[PDB]
């Protein structure tokens, strides 16, 4: 750590604190994540150094020293959360939302093809640059925001799939469109019941095996499903159809990132330049 000079704090996640810092040996500006302290973890995190893609924030180095683990990432100038807040009055232009969703699906199709799951996607770990790119940051291993958590995780599935990332990305897609979080729960049950109130309480018909899930209770209230036309206006039919497939209850029915890339919603995708204030 003698080679790094902290500039300022940029985040505080579940695992640790993220700082903007300068590398004294190269002059590079980086995002440095400090985890306060697992040999299996050092090896798995070191494997993430090889996982390089244009839509993945580069993990430059993993430094294990003095009962701390430091992850050195490339630095990006803004997160999606700051951009969504900056764009709250006007909305993010639809061609930019579509570009960002397309790029994030490319990043997920890549990581998922290598059996790497993120498990905690949220606007704070989606990073953007001035050129129109957006990248996924800080993949997880096998106050906390629950807003983007897949229903199978809330219902106690410990052996979940890559479908958890598609669910989170669908929630973020809805939020870019409407400028409001889709399911802003403030407890595990509030989060689950907010999902049920919009998509209907799941049953064996739409999700086989749901009633045998560890935290499923037969006493859950039975709410009817709402129409997406009411949930994400003014998203067109291609966008609402894609979103509905990203939010299927059954992880096995939920669209994959690869299949989502071929969706007709992306027929006219372009790569616009965002209006960034840094
Ligand atoms: C939760 C996070 N984990 C990682 C690893 C993160 C990461 C990785 C690479 N670049 C960045 N840049 C970043 C993030 C957040 C901000 N806010 C202060 C808006 C900014 N800004 O300049 O403002 C830059 N963050 S952010």
Swiss-Prot record:
It comes from the Eukaryota. The modification N6-acetyllysine is found at residue 6. ATP binds at residues 10-18, 33, 74-76, 79, 122-125, 138. It is found in: Cytoplasm, Cytoskeleton, Microtubule organizing center, Centrosome; Nucleus, Cajal body; Cytoplasm; Endosome. Its cofactor is Mg(2+). This is Cyclin-dependent kinase 2. It holds the Pfam family Pkinase. Found in a complex with CABLES1, CCNA1 and CCNE1. Interacts with CABLES1. Interacts with UHRF2. Part of a complex consisting of UHRF2, CDK2 and CCNE1. Interacts with the Speedy/Ringo proteins SPDYA and SPDYC. Interaction with SPDYA promotes kinase activation via a conformation change that alleviates obstruction of the substrate-binding cleft by the T-loop. Found in a complex with both SPDYA and CDKN1B/KIP1. Binds to RB1 and CDK7. InterPro entries: CDK, Kinase-like_dom_sf, Prot_kinase_dom, Protein_kinase_ATP_BS, Ser/Thr_kinase_AS. The modification Phosphotyrosine is found at residues 15, 19. PROSITE patterns: PROTEIN_KINASE_ATP, PROTEIN_KINASE_DOM, PROTEIN_KINASE_ST. It catalyses: L-seryl-[protein] + ATP = O-phospho-L-seryl-[protein] + ADP + H(+); L-threonyl-[protein] + ATP = O-phospho-L-threonyl-[protein] + ADP + H(+). One of its GO terms (molecular function) is protein serine kinase activity. Induction: Induced transiently by TGFB1 at an early phase of TGFB1-mediated apoptosis. GO terms for biological process: cell division; cellular response to nitric oxide; cellular senescence; centriole replication; centrosome duplication; chromatin remodeling; DNA repair; DNA replication. Transmembrane segments: none annotated. The modification N-acetylmethionine is found at residue 1. GO terms for cellular component: Cajal body; centrosome; chromosome, telomeric region; condensed chromosome; cyclin A1-CDK2 complex; cyclin A2-CDK2 complex; cyclin E1-CDK2 complex; cyclin E2-CDK2 complex. Changing residue 38 to L: In a glioblastoma multiforme sample; somatic mutation. The active site is at residue 120. Its EC number is 2.7.11.22. Residues 4-266 form the Protein kinase domain. The keyword rRNA processing does not apply. The record marks 9, 81-82, 146 as: CDK7 binding. Mg(2+) binds at residues 125, 138.
